[PDB]
């Protein structure tokens, strides 16, 4: 379909300059699955917002705060948000790194819905499902198989063709989605679609997806134009992979490392 | 009004050598806001004090030791503290970062205010309130909204007469004021007010204001002259966000690694 | 017996590019040995995979997450094992390191046994016992005196014969036998066996062992040929010892190091 | 007295190769003072052991894993010193660190003297009392303060004659006493008697002194002669802060990081 590639000239041209940045909500991270909440936490912060603060299980919280000490807390928040709107105002949410795929998830996606920002959607917040008209863009994270889930598109068939799947769904349920793999797509609800050129396999592995949530998010709350902050997250994830394999076998990055090498990739941009 | 600014050879010329260093106390962190702790303890025990206590919530303590295993503890310290004067002698105090906004804090403060030593509030710890006459300086930290709160000054006016105001209230609390901000204000009671030249917006994120807090606790420690003590630890907290910003992004910092970079930055001034 | 060295050369040659990698099981960790399942868990993490699930002590999990946000968890799996056959399917499976050398511990041997995958056998998982025919390789990594707890070969007598031994029981056993000690041995049931030509004494410390048997885990899931994952993580974890006595004293390496070096030494040999 | 130094030459000449290195035994850290476990703790695996068991209180352990998950422990182990003689054997013993000044831990100290090794005794364990004759050095590490508590000399008056009073204490004890400061003695019981000359102000700051234990704990599982073990670690120790200043500033150090310090230290003196 001749997609263009979101390149390091438009990256340039793009990312602000830090001369307020907004407060990020991130509801991710369960007893079962606590990594996640880590992971996103540090990508966020890592990314321009102004504060963070992150809704997880109670007992994930004590896992985070050595790590990231910079985070506050909305103690059990994902779960709260299955009850009740949001009461505060956040420049951008993500929901889902790290929570299970079950209806009570569902519920808190549709109470954050309900707010006026750019919201996120990743890993257990992915399901087959509508959105409702609103101000702010949703934003889908999915891998193949979580686009499978989705839409009943099958992964051997998606991946013969990628673009044009991700173009179809993202006008069809008017939400963007990022179809992540090698040469991640980033499909707009008004047509507009875009590859990424970077990244490699080290990203291949568990955790870099919750890292680019996390990215994403706090790239919202820096850019004033919430597509740019999508592309930009997505290609700059990619070039901390780059820039690791340099000296650095591929098999053996961990996600974390994406954003530990983010301030210095992000340097070169600037 | 030419407020001076607290430059290099200021710093210079003031800061001491390391050829005793007191023992700080940190009464910082509850369970709800845990981080602040952790950031405070990092900068107070970074900047050249001897010993430090942290009276932080119980369940924080766990949250501190693996970074800070330098520290000790009195377990729940900032809540007894609203029950009876301290009964051991410390070179300097710390109250605020990560401690709500309630009376119980207040009732902290006014104990604390009773020893003979200087005294920061920050955070949770700033309140319209007066100050009783006593032997050692009280330090106050507020980002304008907290400034806000101490005196009515409405934020909009408040940025456009920034030292005006900061002189003003420092006078009539009898208070050091450090009014952060892009040129932070630090403003003394016997009228004495200057200007930091030093940081960037690296610092506009959540936790550096902790930091700074522990930064001014530990100078307090091995400065025999509180005032320049405040001065340098503005300067040097700043002056780290500076270096970061040569070979990183001003928008991917996290508080934690201005005490990690406080090292090699203080060496340059000796 | 001339058993041939396996030679930077023949690394060269096996080692796998990264252009799905598999999934692995950790059975590891006990509340009373608790850091054998980090140190096995970031070896594993480092060593190519595409996933981890760790089967830990729930006690234990709390104090993976925040080095190790990577992984995920299988809650008390290690205990679990033992009662029932394995219902998910992971591409490798490693049992023992910090596990006591108990009856249960057998049961989970017995019932992950059944499962269609290489198994890595490893400290308290090393017993006096007989293997069932299966498919996939069953790899055993003793030091000389879980060796001797094997065999009733007491260690004054294995040590002068080492590979003698090793392949003489490999050959009984049916299973592969790493025998740890300087050269160490790598004994195939089909009568291959090669010596380890890299490493030095700074693998002479608690938790070395840990590392190299989640290096094993995570090589098998990289590497189509399982002899090349086993002889490769043995060489590499070897040569980590070795990068690091270029700038760093023999006594002082801690085994976590070796997978913080991994990255750097595993690029130079592709 | 002209106490001669233990030099640069005398290390080169008594530090031993990594060509078994003993399983060491760490008595320390408590609920109120839980840090002081996890700075013995790596100094004494950075120095050169074969194995570490920690024995700390049940809640310290979680705390220290993270960090050093090559230690194994003996839950409650100070505790449980109280009550009966040692049944495993180890090559030498630490207890103190971190240890209230009780007389339960006076018990401890009484049962793991019965034990055949080198002991150290520091902090919480150091009291004035005598000792029975045993095979094995006592080697004692007082700060001044301590000092005072051992043996009624004033510190005022101790710190004009620390030699004269170290090496008289130490021949009325027949221990091996370590007395800190700037130019730490290190006076032995047969008289011998050295002075340190590595080290600045950086040390003067809680924690080092629980690292300094550790590391006398570590060497004395990799030296044969005990004497050198204590003479290495005391100098090695100070090497590392003068290392520190060259691009730190000496007010900035913290206790952990003499520990990272000396992988790189120790080389140099090979
Ligand atoms: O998430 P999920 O797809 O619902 O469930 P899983 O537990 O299988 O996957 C968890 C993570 O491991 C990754 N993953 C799972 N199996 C993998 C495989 N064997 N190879 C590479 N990556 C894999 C997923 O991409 C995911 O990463 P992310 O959460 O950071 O996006
Ligand atoms: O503290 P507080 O002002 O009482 O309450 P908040 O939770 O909003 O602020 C917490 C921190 O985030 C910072 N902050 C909050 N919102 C921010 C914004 N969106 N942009 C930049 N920084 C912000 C505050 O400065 C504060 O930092 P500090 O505690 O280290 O001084
Ligand atoms: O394991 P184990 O042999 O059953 O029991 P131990 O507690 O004595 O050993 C634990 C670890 O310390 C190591 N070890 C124990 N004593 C040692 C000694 N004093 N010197 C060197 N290493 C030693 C073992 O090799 C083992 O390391 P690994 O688990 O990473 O393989
Ligand atoms: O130990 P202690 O002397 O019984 O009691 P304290 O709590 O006062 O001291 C704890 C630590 O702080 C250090 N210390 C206490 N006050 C100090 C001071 N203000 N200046 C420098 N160091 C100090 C002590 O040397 C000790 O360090 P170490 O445990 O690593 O040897």
Not at 80 to 107: C, F, H, N, W
Not at 179 to 195: E, H, M, R, S, Y
């Amino acid at each position: 379909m001749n997609v263009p590639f979101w390149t390091e000239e438009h990256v340039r041209a793009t990312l602000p300059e830090r001369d307020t940045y907004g407060t990020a909500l991130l509801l991710a991270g369960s007893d079962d699955m606590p990594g996640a909440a880590l992971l996103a936490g540090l990508g966020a912060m890592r990314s321009g917002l102004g504060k963070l603060v992150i809704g997880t299980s109670e007992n994930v919280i004590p896992l985070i705060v050595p790590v990231l000490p910079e985070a506050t807390y909305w103690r059990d928040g994902w779960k709260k948000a299955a009850d009740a709107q949001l009461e505060e105002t956040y420049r951008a949410i993500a929901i889902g790194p790290g929570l299970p795929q079950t209806e009570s998830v569902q519920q808190a996606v549709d109470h954050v819905l309900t707010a006026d920002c750019p919201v996120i959607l990743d890993a257990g917040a992915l399901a087959k499902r509508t959105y409702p008209k609103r101000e702010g863009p949703v934003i889908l994270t999915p891998h193949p198989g979580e686009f499978f889930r989705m839409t009943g598109v099958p992964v051997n068939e998606l991946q013969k063709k990628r673009a044009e799947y991700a173009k179809e769904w993202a006008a069809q349920l008017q939400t963007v989605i990022v179809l992540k793999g090698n040469q991640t797509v980033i499909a707009f609800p008004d047509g507009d679609c875009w590859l990424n050129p970077t990244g490699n396999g080290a990203l291949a592995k568990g955790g870099t997806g919750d890292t680019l949530t996390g990215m994403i998010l706090g790239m919202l709350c820096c850019h004033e134009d919430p597509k740019h902050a999508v592309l930009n997250a997505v290609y700059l994830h990619g070039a901390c992979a780059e820039l690791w394999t340099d000296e650095h076998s591929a098999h053996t990055l961990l996600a974390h490392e994406l954003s530990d090498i983010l301030p210095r990739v992000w340097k070169r941009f600037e």
